[PDB]
TrEMBL record, chain A:
<feature type="disulfide bond">
    <location>
        <begin position="54"/>
        <end position="65"/>
    </location>
</feature>
<dbReference type="GO" id="GO:0032543">
    <property type="term" value="P:mitochondrial translation"/>
</dbReference>
<feature type="region of interest" description="Disordered">
    <location>
        <begin position="92"/>
        <end position="116"/>
    </location>
</feature>
<dbReference type="InterPro" id="IPR033620">
    <property type="entry name" value="Ribosomal_mS37_met"/>
</dbReference>
<feature type="disulfide bond">
    <location>
        <begin position="44"/>
        <end position="75"/>
    </location>
</feature>
UniProtKB/TrEMBL annotation, chain B:
<comment type="similarity">
    <text>Belongs to the bacterial ribosomal protein bS21 family.</text>
</comment>
<keyword id="KW-0687">Ribonucleoprotein</keyword>
<dbReference type="InterPro" id="IPR038380">
    <property type="entry name" value="Ribosomal_bS21_sf"/>
</dbReference>
<protein>
    <submittedName>
        <fullName>28S ribosomal protein S21, mitochondrial</fullName>
    </submittedName>
</protein>
<keyword id="KW-0689">Ribosomal protein</keyword>
Automatic annotation (TrEMBL), chain D:
<keyword id="KW-0687">Ribonucleoprotein</keyword>
<dbReference type="GO" id="GO:0006412">
    <property type="term" value="P:translation"/>
</dbReference>
<keyword id="KW-0689">Ribosomal protein</keyword>
<dbReference type="GO" id="GO:0003735">
    <property type="term" value="F:structural constituent of ribosome"/>
</dbReference>
<dbReference type="GO" id="GO:0005763">
    <property type="term" value="C:mitochondrial small ribosomal subunit"/>
</dbReference>
TrEMBL record, chain E:
<dbReference type="GO" id="GO:0005743">
    <property type="term" value="C:mitochondrial inner membrane"/>
</dbReference>
<comment type="similarity">
    <text>Belongs to the universal ribosomal protein uS7 family.</text>
</comment>
<dbReference type="InterPro" id="IPR000235">
    <property type="entry name" value="Ribosomal_uS7"/>
</dbReference>
<dbReference type="GO" id="GO:0005840">
    <property type="term" value="C:ribosome"/>
</dbReference>
<dbReference type="GO" id="GO:0006412">
    <property type="term" value="P:translation"/>
</dbReference>
Length: 116, 86, 96, 137, 208, 23
RNA sequence: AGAGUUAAAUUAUAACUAAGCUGUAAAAAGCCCUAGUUAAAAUAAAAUAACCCACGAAAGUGACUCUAAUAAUCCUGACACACGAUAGCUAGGACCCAAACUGGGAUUAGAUACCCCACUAUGCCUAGCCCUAAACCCAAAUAGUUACAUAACAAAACUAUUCGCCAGAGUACUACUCGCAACUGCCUAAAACUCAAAGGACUUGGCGGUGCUUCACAUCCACCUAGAGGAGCCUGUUCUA
């Protein structure tokens, strides 16, 4: 549940030492934060390792082993396909909540009233 | 040390699945808060900084809980408007 | 609202209850004032911003022969009337 | 198919065997994954060191051994030496949070060791020794 | 640039249109291709419906072309093909019966095989980190690999030859060496692979 | 803001400490 | 405030294995009496519980057990009395770990800094001093009200009884006095002289080697082609004449 807020802030009516020192006022805004984009990372490292394992033992020749190189090519193709498709699927769907653009309008429909 | 070994923070793999067992253990540690504590204990933090971090985290948790509660409350009104054009 | 306390009869398990004696007392005066304004050839504008009964209010105003406003109320409508409506426009004599 | 992720403690009477040996006699693999290096030591149940391999022992360098590929290679290097002495199942005990944490665990399987369990024995003091000061003053 | 975005690339394959009834998946697309009023660009002069032309050969000729002497580039390509054909025929006639069943005289297949042999597998990308540039190993696209394979051979044959030796004569020897996996192009590919194997530990710097 | 006066007082105190150390 | 105890980690210490360990964006230095696993006293500190908000006048206090114990039949009130975080001093003891200073290694034009390594005072116990903090929740104590009423921001505006302070700014947490186990110390604390300002809050631009999203199509990179800077000449400049 929501953590208690009674007796936390520094106010004239509060007799004790304040517990929380908010950086900004605890006012519920009418817009949620934008979804952060995930930082990318290198891919197919484990397959490049086994591809170079062929070269290190076979004096850098591709006629010795072929399955590792083909698997690395398949991994590169799959990584490219995932980079292309996920870049448009993730910004569209989250599977757990509404898009931030719709959430902002929903919050503007029923905003908070810090005043009056 | 004095406790018995292979009891705490131990997960048994299922049918040779190691990647999933490692993810399960990582989730165990994250939910128990050990990952954050280990990352924090690499360098000592002064008590003033610890208090500031605790206050900031508490305020952030309160704000996030209230925002999630309001989102769940207002989720009903996401339906299509029946009085369009009036 | 803080100013609704004198106009409330009480609270029935959280829900406030409005007394009907004062409701009727105010409504008699309101209807008398509206009828006198209509009798004296006054422009009556039914204003309401609520997306449930907009069509009903528009039909009621059409039947009455008075004017209605149930859409987005523009900024300088009543104040900057000579620039929002026309060169010389007669403002409504009653707003409901 | 009732499977429990909890370890099979010796105090119980469950009948689980790997290659005919009980969970207590299965060898151990201590993987210390630091922020700059990853070391693996495969020992027997009697605490007898069987195999040892670190990222620096594979011809890497200062910043080269700190990556996950170095730990993945060290896993295979340790697994080869473990299999050379007749080891088929091992209990992985991880120590420390580093980039080559899961890399060594999967490198063991790549090198041919079947992991039955992953134990996270990371030293977390109960506010004991004071660590070093923070960086970026 | 004069063609608008609505213009679509033409299809030159005649067998694609000769038998549209052999499959139904292509029918659903080729029936709506023209229904949407899709305009088609003009067919380029380089590309035609001839069966003796290859896109790889056309790309190599375009890369070898200097300025706008397409006629000279085409003549050089034809002379290189003639030279490799005659050099293969000479060895075919000089060899015994057992080698005749193994030696190949078709220039197109040996050209394609040499290009594939000299195609690199992975490349290096310079990434700036900490104020210094690191050559991170990176998988390469098919077009990039083919372009590098062609460019290495072209650059080697343009500069590493004697003045009296002509471009078709040098290219004929280089194609055979690449096909047999002995050429300096293959040596350069091996050098690139060894550099990538040396810098493999820096592959974590890549973020894609 | 008030940091200007704080820094001015800090500089004065530092100079006074250096003078005391020298003399 | 005393007395007793230690779960995790670490270490002095032994055995097996192995060669590096540590170190950073990258390196170098350092240790190879090194590293991993198994056992391991002493010192230091006291993960989660804590999304708890209690105790104490404040400072401050949250590993466990025991003893003593948290004034006032409750207003304000000092220069009087008693306390008073960290740091520092004196004498004795302990010293895992961290670390002023220092000595090396990086970077830089310089780096007596930020980065890494080793180590000292010190942080740890007893007694005696020192009595300072952005000792700030920058909001005095005691009993109240939501009446009138938004300079601005911020923690909304105010009553009744008091105490302590405030008279432009710099000079100035200064000099000269008194007092103090303090002697490079603390409290109190001016003047000459210079200026017409010194300041608090806010608005709009601009900037940001702040951060988060969307971009660069000859544009930044990943990449392509053709050139300049090398030679002669033409031509235009800057220089001597
Ligand atoms: Mg209190
Ligand atoms: Mg603030
Ligand atoms: Mg500082
Ligand atoms: Mg000054
Ligand atoms: Mg004591
Ligand atoms: Mg212990
Ligand atoms: Mg000792
Ligand atoms: Mg060295
Ligand atoms: Mg504790
Ligand atoms: Mg009391
Ligand atoms: Mg009193
Ligand atoms: Mg002290
Ligand atoms: Mg010491
Ligand atoms: Mg140290
Ligand atoms: Mg130095
Ligand atoms: Mg003190
Ligand atoms: Mg304080
Ligand atoms: Mg004050
Ligand atoms: Mg007082
Ligand atoms: Mg205003
Ligand atoms: Mg003055
Ligand atoms: Mg002072
Ligand atoms: Mg003084
Ligand atoms: Mg350009
Ligand atoms: Mg030219
Ligand atoms: Mg030039
Ligand atoms: Mg020139």
């Amino acid at each position: 549940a929501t953590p208690s807020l009674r007796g936390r802030l520094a106010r004239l009516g509060n007799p004790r030492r304040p517990i929380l020192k908010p950086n900004k006022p605890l006012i519920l805004a009418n817009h949620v934060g934008e979804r952060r984009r995930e930082k990318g990372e290198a891919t197919c490292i484990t397959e490049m390792s086994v591809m170079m394992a062929c070269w290190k033992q076979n004096e850098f020749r591709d006629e010795a082993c072929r399955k590792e190189i083909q698997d690395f090519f398949d991994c590169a193709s799959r990584a490219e396909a995932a980079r292309k498709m996920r870049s448009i699927q993730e910004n569209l769907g989250e599977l757990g909540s509404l898009p931030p653009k719709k959430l902002n309008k929903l919050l503007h429909r029923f905003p908070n009233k810090p005043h009056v | 040390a004095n406790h018995l070994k292979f009891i705490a923070r131990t997960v048994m793999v299922q049918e040779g699945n190691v990647e999933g067992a490692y993810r399960t253990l990582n989730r165990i540690l994250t939910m128990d808060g050990l990952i954050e504590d280990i990352k924090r204990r690499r360098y000592y933090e002064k008590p003033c900084r610890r208090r500031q971090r605790e206050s900031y985290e508490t305020c952030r948790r309160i704000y996030n809980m209230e925002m999630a509660r309001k989102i769940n409350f207002l989720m009903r009104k996401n339906r299509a408007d029946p009085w369009q054009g009036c | 609202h803080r100013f609704m306390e004198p106009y409330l009869f009480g609270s029935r398990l959280g829900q406030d209850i409005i007394d009907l004696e004062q409701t009727a007392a105010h409504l008699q005066l309101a209807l008398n004032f509206t009828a006198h304004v209509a009798y004296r050839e006054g422009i009556i504008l039914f204003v309401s911003r609520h997306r449930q009964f907009a069509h009903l209010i528009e039909t009621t105003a059409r039947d009455c022969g008075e004017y209605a406003h149930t859409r987005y109320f523009k900024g300088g409508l009543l104040t900057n009337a000579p620039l929002l409506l026309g060169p010389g426009v007669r403002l409504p004599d009653l707003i409901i | 198919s009732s499977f429990s992720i909890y370890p099979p403690i010796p105090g119980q009477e469950n009948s689980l065997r790997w290659a005919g040996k009980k969970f207590e006699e299965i060898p151990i693999a201590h993987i210390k994954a630091s922020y700059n290096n990853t070391q693996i030591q495969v020992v027997s149940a009697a605490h007898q060191p069987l195999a040892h391999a670190s990222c620096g022992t594979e011809g890497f360098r200062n910043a080269k051994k700190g990556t996950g590929i170095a730990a993945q290679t060290a896993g295979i290097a340790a697994a080869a030496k473990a299999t050379g002495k007749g080891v088929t199942h091992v209990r992985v005990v991880v120590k420390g949070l580093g980039p080559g944490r899961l890399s060594a665990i999967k490198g063991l399987t790549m090198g041919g060791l079947e992991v039955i369990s992953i134990t996270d024995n990371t030293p977390i003091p109960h506010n004991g020794c004071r660590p070093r000061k923070a960086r970026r003053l | 640039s004069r063609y608008g975005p609505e213009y679509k690339d033409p299809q030159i394959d005649k067998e694609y249109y000769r038998k549209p009834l052999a499959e139904q998946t292509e029918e659903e697309k080729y029936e709506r291709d023209f229904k949407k009023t899709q305009l088609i660009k003009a067919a380029p002069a380089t590309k035609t419906s001839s069966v003796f032309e290859d896109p790889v050969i056309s790309k190599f000729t375009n890369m070898m072309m200097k300025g706008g002497n397409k006629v000279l580039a085409r003549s050089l390509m034809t002379q290189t093909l003639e030279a490799v054909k005659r050099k293969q025929f000479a060895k075919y006639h000089a060899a015994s019966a057992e080698e005749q069943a193994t030696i190949e005289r078709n220039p197109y297949t040996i050209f394609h095989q040499a290009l594939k042999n000299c195609e690199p597998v992975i490349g290096l990308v310079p990434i700036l980190k900490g104020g210094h540039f690191y050559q991170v190993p990176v998988p390469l696209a098919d077009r990039r690999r083919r372009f590098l394979a062609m460019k290495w051979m072209i650059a080697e044959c343009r500069e590493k030859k004697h003045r009296r030796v002509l471009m078709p004569e040098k290219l004929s020897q280089e194609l055979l060496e690449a096909f047999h996996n002995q050429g300096p192009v293959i040596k350069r590919k091996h050098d690139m692979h060894k550099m990538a194997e040396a810098n493999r530990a820096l592959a974590h710097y890549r973020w894609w | 803001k008030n940091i200007l006066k704080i820094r001015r007082r800090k500089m004065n105190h530092h100079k006074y400490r250096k003078l005391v150390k020298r003399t």
